Amino acid sequence: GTRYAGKVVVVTGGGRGIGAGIVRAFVNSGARVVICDKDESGGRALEQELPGAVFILCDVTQEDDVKTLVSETIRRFGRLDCVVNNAGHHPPPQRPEETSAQGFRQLLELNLLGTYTLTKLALPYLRKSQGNVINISSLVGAIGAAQAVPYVATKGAVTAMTKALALDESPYGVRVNCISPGNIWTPLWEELAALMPDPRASIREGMLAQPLGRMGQPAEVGAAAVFLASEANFCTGIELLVTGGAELGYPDI
Amino acid sequence: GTRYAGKVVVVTGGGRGIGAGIVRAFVNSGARVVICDKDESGGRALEQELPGAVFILCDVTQEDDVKTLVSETIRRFGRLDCVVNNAGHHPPPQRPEETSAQGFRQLLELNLLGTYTLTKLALPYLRKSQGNVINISSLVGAIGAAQAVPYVATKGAVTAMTKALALDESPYGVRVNCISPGNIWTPLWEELAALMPDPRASIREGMLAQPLGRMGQPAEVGAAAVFLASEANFCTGIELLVTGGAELGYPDI
Amino acid sequence: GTRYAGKVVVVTGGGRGIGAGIVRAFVNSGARVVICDKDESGGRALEQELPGAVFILCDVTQEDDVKTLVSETIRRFGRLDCVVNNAGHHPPPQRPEETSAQGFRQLLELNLLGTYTLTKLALPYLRKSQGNVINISSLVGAIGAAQAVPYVATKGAVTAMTKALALDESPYGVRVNCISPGNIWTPLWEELAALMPDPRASIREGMLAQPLGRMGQPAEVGAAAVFLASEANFCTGIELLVTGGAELGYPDI
Amino acid sequence: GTRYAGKVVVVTGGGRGIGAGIVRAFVNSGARVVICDKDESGGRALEQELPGAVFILCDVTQEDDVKTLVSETIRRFGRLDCVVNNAGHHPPPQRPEETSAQGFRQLLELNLLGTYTLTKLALPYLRKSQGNVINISSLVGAIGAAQAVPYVATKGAVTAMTKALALDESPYGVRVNCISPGNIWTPLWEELAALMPDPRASIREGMLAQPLGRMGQPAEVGAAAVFLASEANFCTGIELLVTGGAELGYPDI
Ligand SMILES: NC(=O)c1ccc[n+]([C@@H]2O[C@H](COP(=O)([O-])OP(=O)(O)OC[C@H]3O[C@@H](n4cnc5c(N)ncnc54)[C@H](O)[C@@H]3O)[C@@H](O)[C@H]2O)c1
Ligand SMILES: NC(=O)c1ccc[n+]([C@@H]2O[C@H](COP(=O)([O-])OP(=O)(O)OC[C@H]3O[C@@H](n4cnc5c(N)ncnc54)[C@H](O)[C@@H]3O)[C@@H](O)[C@H]2O)c1
Ligand SMILES: NC(=O)c1ccc[n+]([C@@H]2O[C@H](COP(=O)([O-])OP(=O)(O)OC[C@H]3O[C@@H](n4cnc5c(N)ncnc54)[C@H](O)[C@@H]3O)[C@@H](O)[C@H]2O)c1
Ligand SMILES: NC(=O)c1ccc[n+]([C@@H]2O[C@H](COP(=O)([O-])OP(=O)(O)OC[C@H]3O[C@@H](n4cnc5c(N)ncnc54)[C@H](O)[C@@H]3O)[C@@H](O)[C@H]2O)c1
Ligand SMILES: O=C(c1ccc(F)c(O)c1)c1cccc(-c2ccc(O)c(O)c2)n1
Ligand SMILES: O=C(c1ccc(F)c(O)c1)c1cccc(-c2ccc(O)c(O)c2)n1
Ligand SMILES: O=C(c1ccc(F)c(O)c1)c1cccc(-c2ccc(O)c(O)c2)n1
Ligand SMILES: O=C(c1ccc(F)c(O)c1)c1cccc(-c2ccc(O)c(O)c2)n1
Ligand SMILES: OC[C@H]1O[C@@H](O)[C@H](O)[C@@H](O)[C@@H]1O
Ligand SMILES: OC[C@H]1O[C@@H](O)[C@H](O)[C@@H](O)[C@@H]1O
Ligand SMILES: OC[C@H]1O[C@@H](O)[C@H](O)[C@@H](O)[C@@H]1O
Ligand SMILES: OC[C@H]1O[C@@H](O)[C@H](O)[C@@H](O)[C@@H]1O
Ligand code: NA
Ligand code: NA
Ligand code: NA
Ligand code: NA
């Protein structure tokens, strides 16, 4: 309850799923947390549940929403120590010829440019606090996936951007790192599985895709985030895999 | 002169620099080449110089330009075997706070979405020929760079997209690979160096950034592309580094 | 003081440097720690200093020493939860033609096979406790280094071995991970620098090799180890970089 | 037939499998080739078959054999341009507790130290010719595999060693690169499959482990080697994947 005491953290998409687990992990560490989400339902309930967490409605694709997010965080808590760029989306499976340039642009707006915009607006305050940035990317940005060309491209961009910004901000003492989760059991996972012909088979396949034989939990991503913020003081520009081992391991005509 | 005989290749941004070297390499291999560029000057001269190469004016950010590029290639040569997505740009060095969301969007349009659009429109013809895609990414997408957050993000996206599409197109026999060059001596390199306080010092630094002690040549990228198209039949989804060893190698408070 | 309470940890080479920092981190987390070292001096003093740590003289290249290490840990503390394979050595800088096959074999014995032997003898007890293995590898195993062919080869082997064993032990609930440090200020660093023509210049160069502008501390490696043991329950087979950003970032004839 | 004309190449383990395909590729490129193997049967027949190839009996684990290999190559052909370190072995599948330190040492002798020894003895001649080294590593050194801790460790060592030596030899103009194959259909693959309960099922599984839906051919590894030797003049320290896409791609308790 003291590892990140006195610190102020913003978690985008913190109303459910991974983001809510990150929120819980930081509150449990002693931090005050600002839950950003475009949806009221989960984040408002989370603010009532957790002393030390508050909810601010904010769509990270709307620059003026993000400006107000940052200015309200400073107005209410007087400092900013860590930004967790978790808001993002995975579309349903799509064959390459079923994708569109305009759909790709929209997904870039959320998964890439919303992370960019909050980070840019927060960096002046992070420099004052010697704070840090944590981006939530994905394993499939590193190794690829099927029926997801736009999603994979956006996460490859997030991981690379993390390394570029780590270089730029290192002279000012601001660390920039990312987490690449694999299959984490969240409402997004549940929603996508429900679109499949056999949802229960899809979930079983998802569980067995990891050597550890289960999907991950939001709380496990949250523990990795608290580590990066509070104890990884010589880490910058890293990609922390939270995947259960999915990337490990695997007539001529 | 026979390694890629009878084949038809499209090279975007083929009017100068790396793209022109790729054009030359494929002509030397026996292929017919379509030089795509938004600028007339270099590509028109290249078409007069090289029997087997022709020039088509096409801005890869304009979908109707790319549609006409593909339909004219098929109309004139009857098949399409390889697309080399080389068109791209590196902005001048920019601190993160000096970048803009709108500038980032524009660079994504060229470096990422123009590659996406040509590949999408070409894939029906590549499936008929069991052809292949070669994307020109960058080393800095993998390891980062300073004063280039948008550029690095776009190339991280290209490399990841390459792996996703390789998975999607493998059942149809179409390979999708990328080349990640390091410092290659091109007109873009010369133009950026000329913006520096000391251009000659900037070039010297660029030469010594590689263990091999020089910058690369467009012809060397071109040889790597001809290898991927004509001889790498068990390679798909790879990132071929052409960097001179730049990524190799490198009080407590 | 409770994150790893009730747990028993063995740290090889725990008498000084990184190993001693790992020992301190685990004691501070609430664990009981067995300090293994071939040298009495530092580890004996550490055992007097730290309630909860004890010293066992053991050369990890001597199989019977390691057998007795494991059997004494179980005899004295009744369980084994985590093995940290930290013992290792970096020879002085050596040109490739100055190395020998026999020198290479000796370095493999310490850096690779001593890690293998302790892990093998500990695994039956780790399976009973659902414990975990943490190997201390090196950044240069991933990216290379000059004048160190044998050292680099041994650490490449440790990192790969970590992934293989993670796959083999995942069905039994035992996680296997590694830490790849960059420049950490330790007595080994101090000893190597003292062999250089200008030691102070060598240290200054070492500090500036990181974007963060300093070398790392043993305590920072220790915090990463405690994270992997106590909170990274969905991580197996990962390589956790603790390098200060050294791997980030960087006429044609 | 001219890409590597006038050049002299040594291929270890060239009597069958991948090595024989590399031999054939270099002869087809115009080179003279020395086939090194510990076994007479395949290499002697290959020397009768191929004008331009000769056979020298040599066990790469025996330093005096390798000394004589190099001195006989120079005595017979007057130069040395490329060494392909292909000799190696994969043991039958072994659980970690079924391995031994002594078995691990023996596999290191072949897969790692035999590559080291030939490279060391050849480097003085490679510097005179501005020649190059090609090591045959494995995909599983990078991503791991099950029931193969020693094999995976040896190939992780080869890949890392490649990068270290590339740094050391770059000032002398000698490039050092590796190829990491995935499933290639060779006599070793056939022998291992025959030990399985259902050999035909094992082979079918091996074919489908690649997105491309088949195993690779020795000729495809050979084409990659000829590219690295003859056309990759700005590549050093790279790992060229020849895997068919195996590394691509893939309730909470
Ligand atoms: N679940 C997985 O297996 C998985 C794996 C790897 C990466 N990820 C990444 O983790 C992150 C969280 O994923 P999840 O599974 O928890 O998803 P989720 O859909 O369950 O939760 C996402 C949350 O973000 C919010 N959000 C969406 N768009 C927003 C916007 N424009 N502005 C503000 N908030 C917005 C949503 O309302 C929701 O509360 C995403 O970046 C996703 O790409 C998820
Ligand atoms: N030069 C390097 O060191 C280097 C290193 C790594 C990657 N790259 C990449 O290699 C590629 C080529 O770089 P270069 O140095 O040869 O650049 P260059 O500027 O010398 O040449 C680029 C060419 O592409 C054309 N082009 C630009 N925008 C276009 C558009 N919208 N439509 C069509 N054509 C367009 C230009 O007119 C020009 O002919 C780029 O993708 C670049 O990111 C270059
Ligand atoms: N210091 C760095 O910059 C750095 C960077 C990357 C990796 N590493 C790795 O971290 C580990 C620790 O390095 P360090 O700098 O703390 O070294 P160090 O020399 O300061 O400490 C090593 C300790 O291990 C002990 N040891 C050595 N051989 C042993 C054996 N046979 N049996 C038992 N104990 C033995 C030594 O007596 C000593 O107490 C090593 O594996 C090293 O390769 C160090
Ligand atoms: N076949 C695959 O799927 C695969 C995949 C990845 C890597 N590899 C690697 O490719 C290389 C060749 O494998 P392969 O499948 O062709 O094997 P193979 O067993 O079919 O052929 C190996 C050859 O090397 C020779 N050899 C073995 N030990 C030797 C020694 N001490 N001295 C000299 N020659 C020796 C053998 O006699 C044989 O002719 C090995 O390094 C292997 O690890 C193979
Ligand atoms: O959100 C998902 C996810 C899963 C893993 C990831 F690494 C990631 O970044 C996102 C998810 C959830 C449920 C199904 C799927 C999925 C299923 C089939 C697919 O073809 C696909 O690309 C994704 N992905
Ligand atoms: O175009 C360039 C380039 C260089 C290397 C690359 F890998 C790449 O993709 C692009 C280039 C040319 C000249 C100077 C620079 C450069 C100099 C200072 C910088 O801060 C920077 O980010 C790039 N880049
Ligand atoms: O122990 C060292 C070290 C440094 C960094 C590492 F990643 C690592 O695994 C080990 C160290 C300490 C002091 C100097 C050096 C060093 C200096 C010059 C060299 O040529 C070299 O290969 C290593 N290495
Ligand atoms: O030699 C083989 C091989 C296969 C792939 C590789 F990347 C490699 O370096 C070697 C091979 C051939 C046949 C079966 C197997 C194999 C089967 C089950 C295993 O558990 C295993 O680790 C390897 N490996
Ligand atoms: O909907 C799937 C899962 O989503 C997670 O974010 C919640 O913490 C779980 O309670 C829920 O079962
Ligand atoms: O302008 C830099 C270089 O650009 C390359 O693309 C050309 O091939 C060279 O002739 C020129 O010197
Ligand atoms: O000798 C270099 C450094 O080694 C570290 O292991 C110690 O914790 C420091 O006190 C010491 O300054
Ligand atoms: O034995 C498996 C395969 O091994 C390869 O090295 C040979 O070229 C093939 O003819 C043979 O079928
Ligand atoms: Na609250
Ligand atoms: Na022409
Ligand atoms: Na004690
Ligand atoms: Na012959």
DSSP sequence for B104-131: HHHHHIIIIIHHHHHHHHHHHHHHHHT-
In the reported structure, the alpha carbon of residue A216 is separated from the centroid of ligand 5 by a whole-number distance in angstroms of: 13
Instruction: Give chain B's domain count.
Output: 1
Distance separating alpha carbons of residues B74 and B84, to the nearest angstrom? 16
Distance separating alpha carbons of residues D79 and D68, to the nearest angstrom? 15
Strands (E), A111-245: 132-136, 175-181, 239-242
CB contact under 8 Å between C241 and A242, yes or no, is no
**D126: three-class secondary structure by DSSP:** helix
Residue with tokens 């023509």: C197
Yes or no: say if A159 and A239 are a contact pair by the CB < 8 Å rule.
Answer: yes
Yes or no: say if D120 and D162 are a contact pair by the CB < 8 Å rule.
Answer: no
List the one residue out of B107, B71, B72 whose CA is nearest residue B89.
B107
CB atoms within 10 A of CB B22: 31
Cβ neighbours of C105 in D, within 8 Å: 105, 113
Token readout for B221 is 């990228």
Token readout for D24 is 């054939």
List the one residue out of A185, A181, A159 whose CA is nearest residue A242.
A181
How many CA atoms are closer than 13 Å to the CA of C209, on its beta-carbon side?
Answer: 23
Cβ neighbours of C248 in B, within 8 Å: 143-144
What would you report as the CA-atom Rg of chain C, rounded to the nearest whole angstrom? 18
Distance separating alpha carbons of residues A149 and A91, to the nearest angstrom? 10
Cβ neighbours of D234 in B, within 8 Å: 212, 216-217, 220, 242-244
Distance separating alpha carbons of residues C69 and C59, to the nearest angstrom? 10
> How far, rounded to the nearest angstrom, does the alpha carbon of residue B118 sit from its chain's CA centroid?
12
Instruction: Give the CA angle between residues A96, A101, A104 to the nearest 5°.
Output: 80
Instruction: Give the CA angle between residues C156, C63, C135 to the nearest 5°.
Output: 30
Q: Is C195 in the pocket of ligand 7 (CB under 6 A)?
A: no
Q: How far apart are the first and last CA of chain C?
A: 60
Neighbours of chain D (3+ CB pairs under 8 A): A, B, C
Going across the sheet that includes A32-37, the strands are A53-57, A32-37, A8-12, A82-85, A132-136, A175-181, A239-242
Residue with tokens 């000391």: B198
* B151 is an active site residue: yes
Neighbours of chain B (3+ CB pairs under 8 A): A, C, D
Cα distances from D16 to residues B184, C5, D88, D195, D219, in angstroms, run 39, 57, 12, 20, 12
Q: How far apart are the first and last CA of chain D?
A: 60
Identify the domain containing residue A59 by its residue range.
1-253
Cα distances from B234 to residues B226, D210, D216, D228, in angstroms, run 15, 10, 6, 16
Pairing of strands C8-12, C32-37: parallel
Q: Is C187 in the pocket of ligand 11 (CB under 6 A)?
A: yes
Q: Which residues of D116-136 are buried (b: 16+ CB within 10 A; e: fewer)?
A: bbbbbbbbebbeeeebbbbbb
Q: Which residues of A182-220 are buried (b: 16+ CB within 10 A; e: fewer)?
A: bbbbbebbeebbeeeeeeeebbeebbebbbbebbbbbbb
* Residue to test with chain A: of C3, C132, C234, C236, most A Cβ within 10 A: C234
| Residue A16 marked as a ligand binder | yes
Three-class HEC string of A46-63: HHHHCCCEEEEECCCCCH
Instruction: Give the CA angle between residues D182, D183, D188 to the nearest 5°.
Output: 120
Distance separating alpha carbons of residues D166 and D173, to the nearest angstrom? 10
Yes or no: say if C136 and D124 are a contact pair by the CB < 8 Å rule.
Answer: no
**DSSP-assigned beta bridge partners for residue C160:** none
| Residue A155 marked as a ligand binder | yes
Q: Is C186 in the pocket of ligand 7 (CB under 6 A)?
A: no
> How far, rounded to the nearest angstrom, does the alpha carbon of residue A251 sit from its chain's CA centroid?
43
Token readout for A239 is 């990609």
Distance separating alpha carbons of residues A172 and C213, to the nearest angstrom? 11
Distance separating alpha carbons of residues A171 and D152, to the nearest angstrom? 39
How many CA atoms are closer than 13 Å to the CA of A214, on its beta-carbon side?
Answer: 13
Q: To 10 degrees, what angle do helices A114-129 and A63-77 make? A: 20
In the reported structure, the alpha carbon of residue C225 is separated from the centroid of ligand 11 by a whole-number distance in angstroms of: 18
**DSSP-assigned beta bridge partners for residue B85:** B135
Instruction: Give the CA angle between residues C240, A123, A65 to the nearest 5°.
Output: 115
CB contact under 8 Å between D217 and A144, yes or no, is no
Residue by residue, DSSP assigns C128-191 as: HHT-EEEEE--HHHHH--SS-HHHHHHHHHHHHHHHHHHHHHGGGT-EEEEEEE-SB-SHHHHH
Yes or no: say if B154 and B107 are a contact pair by the CB < 8 Å rule.
Answer: yes
Residue by residue, DSSP assigns D147-199 as: S-HHHHHHHHHHHHHHHHHHHHHGGGT-EEEEEEE-SB-SHHHHHHHHTSSSH
CB-based contacts of D128, cutoff 8 Å, min separation 6: D79
CATH of the domain at A38: 3.40.50.720
Cα distances from D115 to residues C17, D136, D158, D159, in angstroms, run 33, 9, 8, 11
Question: Which residue type sits at B54?
Answer: V
Distance separating alpha carbons of residues A1 and C112, to the nearest angstrom? 39
Q: Is A14 in the pocket of ligand 1 (CB under 6 A)?
A: no
Yes or no: say if B161 and B112 are a contact pair by the CB < 8 Å rule.
Answer: yes
Going across the sheet that includes D32-37, the strands are D53-57, D32-37, D8-12, D82-85, D132-136, D175-181, D239-242
The partner residue sitting opposite B245, judged by closest CB among D170, D212, D233, is D170
Å between C213 CA and nearest CA of chain A: 8
Ligand nearest to the CA of D216: 4
Phi-psi region of B55 (alpha: psi -120 to 50; beta: other; left: phi over 0): beta
Pocket test for ligand 2, best of B107, B155, B184, B207 (most atoms within 8 A of CB): B184
Q: To 10 degrees, what angle do helices A101-108 and B114-129 make? A: 140
Residue with tokens 């790396």: B18
Token readout for A220 is 């496990």
Yes or no: say if B115 and B161 are a contact pair by the CB < 8 Å rule.
Answer: yes
Token readout for A57 is 């409605």
Token readout for C7 is 């747990």
CB-based contacts of B114, cutoff 8 Å, min separation 6: B12, B60, B61, B66, B85, B87
Q: What are phi and psi of C222, to 5 degrees?
A: -60, -40
Distance separating alpha carbons of residues B215 and B186, to the nearest angstrom? 10
Residue with tokens 């000329």: B194
Strands (E), chain D: 8-12, 32-37, 53-57, 82-85, 132-136, 175-181, 239-242
| Residue A37 marked as a ligand binder | yes
Yes or no: say if D168 and C145 are a contact pair by the CB < 8 Å rule.
Answer: no
Distance separating alpha carbons of residues A164 and C245, to the nearest angstrom? 11
In the reported structure, the alpha carbon of residue A9 is separated from the centroid of ligand 13 by a whole-number distance in angstroms of: 14
Pocket test for ligand 4, best of D186, D190, D203, D214 (most atoms within 8 A of CB): D186
Q: Helices in A29-138 by DSSP H: which ranges? A: 40-49, 63-77, 101-108, 114-129
**DSSP-assigned beta bridge partners for residue D34:** D10, D54
Distance separating alpha carbons of residues B216 and B232, to the nearest angstrom? 22
Contact residues, chain B to chain A, C-beta under 8 Å: 63, 95-97, 99, 101, 104-105, 108, 112-113, 116-117, 120, 123, 140-149, 152-169, 237
Q: How far apart are the first and last CA of chain A?
A: 60
- Interface contacts (C, D; CB < 8 Å): 128
Token readout for A221 is 């991503």
Residue with tokens 């050049």: D7
Q: Is C14 in the pocket of ligand 3 (CB under 6 A)?
A: no
Distance separating alpha carbons of residues A31 and A177, to the nearest angstrom? 19
Distance separating alpha carbons of residues B41 and B16, to the nearest angstrom? 9
Give the number of the atom of ligand 9 that is nearest the alpha carbon of residue A219.
8
Distance separating alpha carbons of residues B124 and B172, to the nearest angstrom? 10
How many CA atoms are closer than 13 Å to the CA of C134, on its beta-carbon side?
Answer: 32
Going across the sheet that includes B8-12, the strands are B53-57, B32-37, B8-12, B82-85, B132-136, B175-181, B239-242
List the one residue out of B178, B111, B118, B183 whose CA is nearest residue B151.
B111
Contact residues, chain D to chain B, C-beta under 8 Å: 163, 166-167, 170-171, 211-213, 216-217, 220, 223-224, 227, 231-238, 240-245, 247-249
Task: Give resolution, Å, one decimal.
Answer: 1.6
Distance separating alpha carbons of residues A137 and A141, to the nearest angstrom? 7
